[PDB]
């Protein structure tokens, strides 16, 4: 029990660190774009642009190196999820409808199981009734099924 909790905590910490690093990368890219749009052409601005580019490259390299660690806890995303997330929204209706379909399938399964159970119970009862000589195997049939 303690090992699973420790593994979960380590995975959460690693994912939080990755999230923070990627957020910093995104902020640096936003700053880079802002500087490019409002570039004055001064040598100091050029040096700042070079430093920002180097920092972005170093951050990307560090993220690639850390995320590729075989010992990292990071090591499924279906293509349908990627297709659904391309619609500019908050990702809930896909899960809602597909879980609704899942629940409908489960309810169908339970209802058909109950129906089949009553079917074979009634059939066993009547086979015992009109055919007492076959009563003994029928119960064994239940033992063979249940």
């Amino acid at each position: 029990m303690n090992g699973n909790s420790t593994n979960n905590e380590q995975l959460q910490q690693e994912l939080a660190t990755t999230q923070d690093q990627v957020a910093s990368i995104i902020e640096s890219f936003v700053e880079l774009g802002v500087s490019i749009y409002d570039f004055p052409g001064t040598p100091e601005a050029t040096k700042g642009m070079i430093t920002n580019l180097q920092r972005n490259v170093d951050r990307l390299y560090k993220l690639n190196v850390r995320s590729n660690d075989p010992q990292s806890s990071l090591s499924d995303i279906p293509l349908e999820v990627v297709q659904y997330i391309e619609d500019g929204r908050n990702p809930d209706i896909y899960t809602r409808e597909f879980v609704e379909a899942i629940r409908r399938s489960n309810q169908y399964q339970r209802g058909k199981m109950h129906g089949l159970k009553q079917l074979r119970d009634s059939l066993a009862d009547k086979i015992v009734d009109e055919f007492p000589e076959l009563k003994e195997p029928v119960e064994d049939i239940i033992k063979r099924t249940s």
């Binding site: 959460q12 939080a16 999230q19 890219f29 993220l63």
Partner: protein, 101 residues
């Protein structure tokens, strides 16, 4: 199952290749083109790369939230089309065996 590390490595390789191609194209592009257009193209490329990295960020956040719901979801789906396949197999068996009737 696709490893997240492999996806991240592929995305980084694609980003590096795109950046190298853009730098090369800027290198052999004639100097007659205004620097404003090149700056705009570089900004657009940076925005696209940032969007890809933000998609990776969203995937990382989802994995941080992560599989329990995914595992239940996949198991219930497997049960559903297994039942459907059993129904179709029953129908096919009756269609085939009607000849022997």
């Amino acid at each position: 199952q696709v490893s997240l590390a492999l996806v991240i490595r592929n995305l980084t390789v694609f980003t590096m290749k795109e950046l190298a191609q853009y730098m090369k194209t800027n290198v052999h592009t004639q100097a007659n083109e205004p620097n404003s257009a090149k700056k705009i193209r570089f900004l657009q490329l940076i925005i696209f790369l940032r969007t890809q990295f933000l998609k990776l960020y969203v995937l990382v956040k989802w994995t941080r939230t992560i599989h329990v719901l995914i595992d239940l979801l996949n198991w219930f789906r497997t049960t559903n089309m297994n039942v459907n396949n059993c129904i179709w197999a029953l129908k096919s068996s009756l269609n085939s065996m009607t000849n022997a009737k």
